[PDB]
């Protein structure tokens, strides 16, 4: 069925809320959306499984050796980095139009728009572009950070498609003040991307594609079907005809149901957002693998954690005292994380005590640890006035009002291991008087900007469990209030036009100072020292509750080659970063990568 019609069916447990047109990822920054988009949009510079930059739509990787990189000292130990990129003469959109520097200028104009709800306002403050000609441009970073040359580099969007509407949007934006009209301005920009990112719009041809594949159709709630993009210039060894001509992502929200489908055999490979660790080693799957599929476990920077709303303007937050570190420490002492990873994963996915995964050398193994101890949790909560009500749940008075310790606990509905986790933790939390109100929804709902990036508006008011998948551009921005080098605030609120990813609203000036300096440190050891100090502070304050570090399980049909992932392949550590060379060996596809060396033993 695979080599038969020369297709690739990929199974996933989460579906993108929007696709293609949301190129700054302001509406959705879902990992599944980014993975799928690798097939549809190619970078100028990619990042392979061997953790190396490599040219894709650009002619070559810029280096000091070839003069494409220029570092100049601007004083005070800071630098200016210039990076020359040349777009290949054959880089083309799926409609036949050339990919040019006008597409780069367009991308920058949108990212630079005042009030644009960008994920990383720091980048947008210090990065600029200079256009030499239709295919030569220079990216300018000032001050430069240690990770600016780290691929992938994808700074372009289809101007001939989105430009006309953008001009209208800009004209309308002139009548709005980013301060007083923040809500309206945010709506204006969201609507711009939505015109080019919903199922109906895309199915009617709203977008064009630069990757090895182009969209055929999006059946929302069911699948995303793509077909070969003949305009993509990188041809795999032996010719593109020997590789897959159609790629279909099938979405099954309940992970157990996805597991059943994967065991059944109709799915050729699994996404980085599919089955959980425990499922990958379950007997019902393992015993059905012989002669059919290979199962791999790939470590990555995947941090399962629980974010905590600490915005004091939400009275529920103040009532529960979530803004006090003692409350967060108490909750963590009540989470039997070691018991959970032992029972659920045989300890193979270790308890995390910091936000940086071990695969990143910045990881600090020495930070403060919070062992499972209900007595300690009880003492901390008692110190803050809590006393058990007759239903066994803690109560206290705040602002003259009687408040109960019932906390919202949100996660991705359908993800069985997380649903089990909530139940597991809830049993212990109840023993000390903390009640949990489960409020789960699909990935496409909870990871949409209007939910995840709106804690300041009290959209979610307690605990929110999920995992952050990181690339090597670590700057601690997930927990910075402000980057001191650019003055960019990283907590999304109406006041900063909903920019940033510090979704829980934490602020620690020392943490900001350390991380802001660390990203400017080009010496690996000094950089690590600063990040280690930042992690020590982070662990004492627990702005989020660390749970465990994950490894992604991949189930791949025998015969399919080059569908390989590594800790940081494609930047975030998932398959599909070399989508043009994935194919069936019986069709002549030439194996160029082997999963073994990047995966856990056996």
């Amino acid at each position: 069925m695979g080599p038969q019609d020369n297709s690739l069916v990929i199974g996933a447990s989460q579906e993108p809320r929007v696709l293609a047109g949301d190129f700054l990822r302001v509406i959705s920054n879902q990992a599944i959306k980014s993975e799928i988009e690798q097939y549809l949009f190619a970078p100028f510079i990619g990042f392979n499984a061997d953790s190396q930059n490599f040219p894709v739509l650009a002619t070559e990787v810029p280096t000091l050796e070839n003069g494409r990189l220029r570092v100049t000292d601007i004083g005070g130990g800071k630098k200016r980095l210039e990076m020359d990129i040349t777009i290949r003469p054959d880089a083309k959109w799926s409609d036949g139009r050339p990919i040019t520097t006008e597409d780069v200028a367009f991308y920058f104009e949108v990212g630079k728009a005042k009030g644009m709800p960008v994920l990383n306002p720091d980048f947008w403050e210090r990065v600029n572009v200079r256009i030499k000609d239709a295919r030569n441009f220079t990216l300018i970073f000032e001050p430069a950070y240690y990770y600016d040359t780290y691929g992938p580099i994808n700074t372009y969007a289809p101007k001939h498609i989105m430009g006309p509407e953008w001009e209208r949007v800009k004209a309308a934006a002139r009548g709005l003040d980013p301060d007083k009209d923040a809500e309206k301005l945010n709506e204006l920009y969201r609507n711009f991307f939505l015109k080019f990112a919903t199922p109906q719009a895309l199915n009617r041809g709203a977008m064009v594609y630069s990757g090895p594949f182009k969209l055929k159709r999006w059946v929302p709630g069911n699948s995303i079907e793509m077909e070969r993009n003949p305009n993509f210039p990188i041809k795999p060894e032996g010719g593109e005809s020997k590789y897959v001509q159609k790629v279909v992502y099938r979405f099954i929200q309940n992970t157990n149901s996805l597991l059943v489908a994967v065991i059944g055999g109709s799915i050729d490979a699994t996404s980085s957002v599919s089955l959980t660790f425990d499922q990958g080693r379950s007997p019902q799957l393992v015993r059905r693998a012989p002669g059919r599929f290979d199962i791999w476990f790939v470590p990555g920077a995947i941090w399962e954690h629980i974010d905590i709303n600490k915005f004091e303007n939400c009275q529920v937050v103040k009532d529960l005292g979530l803004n006090d570190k003692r409350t967060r420490q108490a909750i963590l002492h009540a989470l039997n994380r070691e018991g959970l990873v032992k029972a659920f994963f045989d300890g193979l996915q270790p308890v995390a005590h910091t936000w940086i995964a071990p695969v990143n050398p910045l990881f600090n193994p020495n930070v403060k640890k919070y062992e499972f101890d209900l007595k300690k949790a009880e003492a901390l909560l008692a110190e803050m006035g809590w006393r058990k009500g007759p239903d066994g749940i803690l109560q206290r008075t705040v602002n003259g009002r009687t408040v109960r310790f019932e906390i919202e606990y949100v996660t991705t509905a359908g993800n069985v291991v997380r649903e089990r986790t909530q139940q597991f933790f809830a049993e212990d939390l109840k023993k000390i008087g903390i009640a949990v109100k489960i409020n789960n929804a699909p990935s496409a709902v909870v990871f949409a900007d209007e939910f995840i990036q709106r804690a300041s508006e009290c959209k979610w008011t307690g605990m929110f469990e999920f995992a952050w998948v990181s690339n090597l551009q670590e700057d601690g921005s997930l927990f910075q209030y402000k980057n001191l080098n650019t003055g960019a605030i990283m907590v999304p609120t109406k006041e900063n036009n909903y920019q940033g990813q510090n979704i829980g609203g934490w602020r620690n000036d020392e943490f900001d100072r350390l991380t802001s300096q660390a990203v400017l440190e080009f010496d690996p050891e000094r950089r690590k020292q600063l990040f280690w100090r930042a992690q020590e502070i982070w662990a004492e304050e627990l702005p989020a509750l660390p749970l465990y570090f994950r490894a992604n399980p991949y189930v791949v049909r025998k015969g399919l080659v080059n569908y390989v992932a590594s800790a940081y392949s494609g930047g975030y550590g998932y398959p599909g970063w070399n989508a043009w060379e994935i194919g069936w060996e019986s069709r002549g596809a030439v194996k160029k990568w082997d999963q073994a060396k990047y995966a856990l033993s056996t």
Binding site: Q14, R25, N29, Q30, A31, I32, S34, L119, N120, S272, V273, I302, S443, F447, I452, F466, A467, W468, V469, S470, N471, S477, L478, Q501, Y572
Partner: peptide, 5 residues
């Protein structure tokens, strides 16, 4: 910009 899953 870390991604969610």
């Amino acid at each position: 910009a870390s991604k969610p899953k």
